[PDB]
Amino acid sequence: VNVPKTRKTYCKGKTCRKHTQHKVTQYKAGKASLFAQGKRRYDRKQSGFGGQTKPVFHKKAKTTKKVVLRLECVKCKTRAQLTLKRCKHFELGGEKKQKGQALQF
Amino acid sequence: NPVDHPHGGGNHQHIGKASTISRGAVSGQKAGLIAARRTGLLRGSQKTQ
Amino acid sequence: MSKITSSQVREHVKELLKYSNETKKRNFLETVELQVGLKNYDPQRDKRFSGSLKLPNCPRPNMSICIFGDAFDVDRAKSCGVDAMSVDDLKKLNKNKKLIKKLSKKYNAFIASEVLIKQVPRLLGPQLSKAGKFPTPVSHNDDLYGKVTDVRSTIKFQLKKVLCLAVAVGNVEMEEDVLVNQILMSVNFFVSLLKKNWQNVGSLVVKSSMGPAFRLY
Amino acid sequence: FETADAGSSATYPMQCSALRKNGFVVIKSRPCKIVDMSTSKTGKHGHAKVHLVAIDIFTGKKLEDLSPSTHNMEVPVVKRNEYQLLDIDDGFLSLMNMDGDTKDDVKAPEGELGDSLQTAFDEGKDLMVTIISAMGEEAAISFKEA
Amino acid sequence: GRVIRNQRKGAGSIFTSHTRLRQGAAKLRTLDYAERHGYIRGIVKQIVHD
Amino acid sequence: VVDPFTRKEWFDIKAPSTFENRNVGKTLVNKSTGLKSASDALKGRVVEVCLADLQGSEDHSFRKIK
RNA sequence: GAAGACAUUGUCAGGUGGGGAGUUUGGCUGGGGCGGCACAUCUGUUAAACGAUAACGCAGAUGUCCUAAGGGGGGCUCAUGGAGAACAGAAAUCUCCAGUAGAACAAAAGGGUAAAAGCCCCCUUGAUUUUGAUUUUCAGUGUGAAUACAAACCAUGAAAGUGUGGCCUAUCGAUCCUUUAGUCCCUCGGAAUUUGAGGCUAGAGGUGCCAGAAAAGUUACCACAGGGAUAACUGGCUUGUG
RNA sequence: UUGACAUUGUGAAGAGACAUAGAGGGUGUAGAAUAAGUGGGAGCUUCGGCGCCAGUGAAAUACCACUACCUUUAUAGUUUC
RNA sequence: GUGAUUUCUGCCCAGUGCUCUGAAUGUCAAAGUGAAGAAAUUCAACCAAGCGCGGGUAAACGGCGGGAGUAACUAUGACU
Ligand SMILES: C[NH+](C)c1cc(NC(=O)CNC(C)(C)C)c(O)c2c1C[C@H]1C[C@H]3[C@H]([NH+](C)C)C(O)=C(C(N)=O)C(=O)[C@@]3(O)C(O)=C1C2=O
Ligand SMILES: C[NH+](C)c1cc(NC(=O)CNC(C)(C)C)c(O)c2c1C[C@H]1C[C@H]3[C@H]([NH+](C)C)C(O)=C(C(N)=O)C(=O)[C@@]3(O)C(O)=C1C2=O
Ligand SMILES: C[NH+](C)c1cc(NC(=O)CNC(C)(C)C)c(O)c2c1C[C@H]1C[C@H]3[C@H]([NH+](C)C)C(O)=C(C(N)=O)C(=O)[C@@]3(O)C(O)=C1C2=O
Numbered sequence A: 001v002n003v004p005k006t007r008k009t010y011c012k013g014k015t016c017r018k019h020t021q022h023k024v025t026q027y028k029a030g031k032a033s034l035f036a037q038g039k040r041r042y043d044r045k046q047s048g049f050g051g052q053t054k055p056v057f058h059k060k061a062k063t064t065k066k067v068v069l070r071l072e073c074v075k076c077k078t079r080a081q082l083t084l085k086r087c088k089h090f091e092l093g094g095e096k097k098q099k100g101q102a103l104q105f
Numbered sequence B: 001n002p003v004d005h006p007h008g009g010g011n012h013q014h015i016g017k018a019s020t021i022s023r024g025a026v027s028g029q030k031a032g033l034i035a036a037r038r039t040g041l042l043r044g045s046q047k048t049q
Numbered sequence C: 001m002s003k004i005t006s007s008q009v010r011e012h013v014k015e016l017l018k019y020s021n022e023t024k025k026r027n028f029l030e031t032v033e034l035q036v037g038l039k040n041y042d043p044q045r046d047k048r049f050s051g052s053l054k055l056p057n058c059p060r061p062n063m064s065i066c067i068f069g070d071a072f073d074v075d076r077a078k079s080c081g082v083d084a085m086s087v088d089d090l091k092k093l094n095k096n097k098k099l100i101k102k103l104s105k106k107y108n109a110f111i112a113s114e115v116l117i118k119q120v121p122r123l124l125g126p127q128l129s130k131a132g133k134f135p136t137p138v139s140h141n142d143d144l145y146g147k148v149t150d151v152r153s154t155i156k157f158q159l160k161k162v163l164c165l166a167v168a169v170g171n172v173e174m175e176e177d178v179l180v181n182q183i184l185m186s187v188n189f190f191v192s193l194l195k196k197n198w199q200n201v202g203s204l205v206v207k208s209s210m211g212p213a214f215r216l217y
Numbered sequence D: 001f002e003t004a005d006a007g008s009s010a011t012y013p014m015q016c017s018a019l020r021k022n023g024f025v026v027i028k029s030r031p032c033k034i035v036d037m038s039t040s041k042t043g044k045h046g047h048a049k050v051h052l053v054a055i056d057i058f059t060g061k062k063l064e065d066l067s068p069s070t071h072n073m074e075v076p077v078v079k080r081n082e083y084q085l086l087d088i089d090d091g092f093l094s095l096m097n098m099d100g101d102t103k104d105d106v107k108a109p110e111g112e113l114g115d116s117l118q119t120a121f122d123e124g125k126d127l128m129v130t131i132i133s134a135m136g137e138e139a140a141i142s143f144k145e146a
Numbered sequence E: 001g002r003v004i005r006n007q008r009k010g011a012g013s014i015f016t017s018h019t020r021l022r023q024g025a026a027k028l029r030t031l032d033y034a035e036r037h038g039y040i041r042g043i044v045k046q047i048v049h050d
Numbered sequence F: 001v002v003d004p005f006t007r008k009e010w011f012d013i014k015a016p017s018t019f020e021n022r023n024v025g026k027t028l029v030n031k032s033t034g035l036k037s038a039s040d041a042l043k044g045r046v047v048e049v050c051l052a053d054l055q056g057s058e059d060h061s062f063r064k065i066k
Numbered sequence G: 001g002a003a004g005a006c007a008u009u010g011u012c013a014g015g016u017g018g019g020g021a022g023u024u025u026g027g028c029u030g031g032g033g034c035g036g037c038a039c040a041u042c043u044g045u046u047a048a049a050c051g052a053u054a055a056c057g058c059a060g061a062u063g064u065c066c067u068a069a070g071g072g073g074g075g076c077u078c079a080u081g082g083a084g085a086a087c088a089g090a091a092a093u094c095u096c097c098a099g100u101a102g103a104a105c106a107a108a109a110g111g112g113u114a115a116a117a118g119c120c121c122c123c124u125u126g127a128u129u130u131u132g133a134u135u136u137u138c139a140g141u142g143u144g145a146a147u148a149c150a151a152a153c154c155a156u157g158a159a160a161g162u163g164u165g166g167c168c169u170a171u172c173g174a175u176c177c178u179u180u181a182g183u184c185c186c187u188c189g190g191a192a193u194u195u196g197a198g199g200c201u202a203g204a205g206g207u208g209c210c211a212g213a214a215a216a217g218u219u220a221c222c223a224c225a226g227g228g229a230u231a232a233c234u235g236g237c238u239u240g241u242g
Numbered sequence H: 001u002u003g004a005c006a007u008u009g010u011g012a013a014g015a016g017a018c019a020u021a022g023a024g025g026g027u028g029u030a031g032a033a034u035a036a037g038u039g040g041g042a043g044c045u046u047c048g049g050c051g052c053c054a055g056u057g058a059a060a061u062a063c064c065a066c067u068a069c070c071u072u073u074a075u076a077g078u079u080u081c
Numbered sequence I: 001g002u003g004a005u006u007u008c009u010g011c012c013c014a015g016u017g018c019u020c021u022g023a024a025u026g027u028c029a030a031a032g033u034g035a036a037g038a039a040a041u042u043c044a045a046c047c048a049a050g051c052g053c054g055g056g057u058a059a060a061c062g063g064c065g066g067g068a069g070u071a072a073c074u075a076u077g078a079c080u
């Protein structure tokens, strides 16, 4: 699906509680740091003898992921997240479609 | 029988898997040709000549 | 982490416009050049990076553009004022090699038409693409003057065989802040097109037309 | 500056029985084309299991697989695209979309099909080539005279 | 499975060698001064079957 | 660059006193470096020469001495 | 006599390792198996004119697509047929007349819609924020979907109004773990400052066996607890077939 | 099985890599051209001329940088075989 | 592994094994090295065997299909 690079939407910041301009990006997940408490617990639990201790997911059924947009306001630099539905293809700011242009096979 | 040997089981007498065992195998697996670089009838005939 | 920030680029672009704007004021409009260079990218092995970016202002403002158009594109070119190159002299030109060489070397950017773009390989030869100049399509709805400015602004980072790339950023008399913003945007576009990003950028030079090659990184 | 890409694994999981002849299947992280299939009953109150023989298309390598017929299998979402060849450069063929002209990354196919393609382009006779795209890799598979 | 025949063979008991009718071990004369410097003369007296 | 012809040096082959030409000729061997004695590389050598060249006269042209 | 700071040996790390060890090897089902999904959903019918309602009943469909195919406003009327106009004919384009919808509304079916909900044009981002209430499945729990408001800020339009995604009915996901956004917030418990870590509020990464185990077989060498809830004889009801 | 550390002391010889600054270089056609390539570039300067235009060729000559590759020079040393 | 003697043991090294003085690190742990930081740490190169790429081996496990046209009866097809 096509979504524009810019969007006027509500800003939660205390200096601007009105509709302000936001740039639209995609949320890419973080680095999954090693010192998180669950990771340290997993390392201690996997250490030793006994093999794998927590389940590992195998039965993947869904192909798509919900896209979530990171909106950064251009004035207060505050960020927000907006969820858009399961789409296989995604283009930030692609070319706009044409109503009645000559088809080209 | 399959309990007594790697080659073992039946309904037909056959090896089942490749009879060329590794050199780096373990005990109980080395029933066959141990580190066979070549197999079959040889002709011929030099090794170091 | 962006290895290259504004502040050092502010200082280096101050000294760049210093050397251009009083020291060796010349008789023609010079252009700012970003020359970049890669380290671990092996051209024969990796996936080739390719991408064009429309600049927020203008580089070289006197590029020489040629319009392969038919009737509406040709008439729009006559209105605006760009050399329009119709199917007439194209099929009057077909029977040669030197003349297509002359056309390709004479006009630097080529602009096309949607209904011409498929038989450009046929009517012309592979020479344009081999040089690195394929005509960019222009629709009938698209305003030709606006797309001419578009093509005189677009910067192309594209690997061909080698590891040094060079792109014109802008002119030497435009204002300091837009030059800083443009060179930062072009650097970030290159880094975004890469695989390992700042890890695999290795060379970052800015220049205008002459000896002093003002390094950024 | 980033690159937008919705999370779309290039595999729909389908079924061992729903894979058919001339198929597409993922055997050990490689695309491959199902060229042979056989169902087989195991026991006496047993179920059927599927033996799959397929050819990896990007290398042309035979890969085999064995699974219970009720289990799910990854099926690559292959995309075949019909492009126009401008000129065969230094091993990396230049290719054209319907209007766009990026596609300059596909290695000129090293087989006899690509050698005959080179002979064709050398005596001109301009062609449209067919390119397959699947799980990050793309390859020219078949030339066709326009 | 089960411990197979070659493993049992290496584990001793039944698969030892029968040394009842064997003579002494067939070994050369040990190194000494006589063999290291000059020569020594022995007489082969009975050739037998091991 | 390896430049073996300046790495090497020339030596003079001389004949037993039964003959009349004392000078037989010249050879070349690598420099006497550590762990490799050029002198042992010289003792490992057999050389061929004409008896006409050894005795001066042409009556011994067919004969060859090693 | 031979080897020599190599090797052996000690400890970690990678590989290999059915030789060995544990464990698993879904459900429904006119017996079980193969097949299928009737396992999470949607439309018409069965369904017996409130609601509810079964079968491996029938006919089908879903795991998508769309920055417009969302929102507002304006102009027009759509299939089809007839009569005509160079090339031009059955059919290319243009008119006129008739035209209650016989078209279209992304997709399956049903419903709805004519100065529109259809087709073109203009502007936009209500596909936004804060939590509550209600309906459907329902235990009146969750998930999903939807309804009507409130406090804001907006869009559109002259305005009334409309708009909290798709004209309506489907298009989807808990704990634990990871990651991101918010205030400039809380804690690191002897006292402070920075990184780090843990919290609170809202999302995403996914469990399709869809209220959500991490999981291959064989056994005629078999074993146990059971079952006529369940098959292979006979009997019984029925007689398509004979 | 492979690697590291320890047992484990005492010495050589030869190679390779890294380490920063220079210098120099890259001749099949054709082009008068000694064309490693990419990019800007119609001006350039030493005031002679060069460059564009022309021609030529797979690509062009001024002004220019950058890129790798190769060769050595300075090269405290570190490190591996 | 096959199973006296006689006779013979055809073709296939794609798969799975097995093997190598084949080739370059493509991937590659711990320890060691360098950069940043106030450090915890993070990121780099270098990176053993192995895996991957290449070759050999079937008295290793094993495998050994189709479809057309084609000869004075027709029919089959030595042949293509
Ligand atoms: C001189 N070369 C041929 C050699 C010879 C021997 N052994 C002998 O002298 C005896 N072998 C003969 C008699 C010549 C057949 C050698 O024993 C060796 C080597 C070479 C080195 C190479 C080392 C190198 N490392 C430093 C990166 C390398 O390229 C590898 C590698 N990954 O292939 C090595 O393994 C290496 O470390 C190495 O082990 C070598 C030798 O041991
Ligand atoms: C497995 N190692 C111990 C080994 C052994 C032998 N030869 C033997 O069998 C040893 N037998 C002897 C000791 C000579 C009697 C070997 O002969 C080799 C090698 C190593 C390979 C490694 C190759 C390698 N890549 C391509 C996998 C590599 O990167 C290099 C390199 N450029 O450093 C190589 O040296 C390699 O290509 C290579 O040549 C090897 C051997 O020759
Ligand atoms: C055939 N031999 C001469 C050899 C040559 C090379 N070098 C090459 O092949 C280089 N040639 C190229 C250009 C890379 C293709 C080699 O690289 C090698 C080897 C063999 C082994 C030697 C091994 C030896 N081990 C068995 C005791 C050894 O001394 C060591 C060691 N302690 O360093 C090894 O690790 C060794 O296994 C080894 O690495 C070898 C090679 O890789």
Ligand SMILES: [Zn+2]
Residues within 6 Å of the ligand: A011, A012, A013, A016, A020, A073, A074, A075, A076, A077, A078
């Ligand atoms: Zn704001």
